[PDB]
């Protein structure tokens, strides 16, 4: 998401697009809603989507 | 559909929280880190 890797949760069901596309899922673009963004001592940014 | 399973030899697994750039997805990144 915008240059940052975020921890993504699912709305109780993975879309069938995942099963269809398999390991090639990176090809397609999805929509994400950022719950929160936080920091860590190592300077990393941990964001939940 | 077509072939659907691939190994880990040539698919970069980005760590969580790490900042990335578009180039990271290229085949060049795999050569560079190997």
């Amino acid at each position: 998401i915008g240059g940052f890797v975020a921890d993504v949760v699912f709305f109780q069901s993975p879309p069938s697009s995942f099963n269809s596309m398999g390991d090639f899922i990176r090809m397609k673009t999805f929509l994400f809603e950022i719950l929160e963004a936080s920091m860590e001592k190592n300077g990393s940014v941990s964001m939940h989507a | 559909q077509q072939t659907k399973k691939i190994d880990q030899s040539l698919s970069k697994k980005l760590p969580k929280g790490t900042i990335y750039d578009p180039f990271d997805f290229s085949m060049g990144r795999i050569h560079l880190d190997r």
Binding site: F24, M27 | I6, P22, F25, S26
Partner: peptide, 25 residues
């Protein structure tokens, strides 16, 4: 990212063909 991922896609299909061929041997 798309203009990179298309090239990555073609490269991966060609290489997986090559490695399947080698493994079959």
């Amino acid at each position: 990212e798309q203009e990179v991922l298309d090239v990555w896609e073609k490269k991966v299909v060609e290489e997986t063909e090559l490695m399947a061929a080698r493994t079959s041997n």
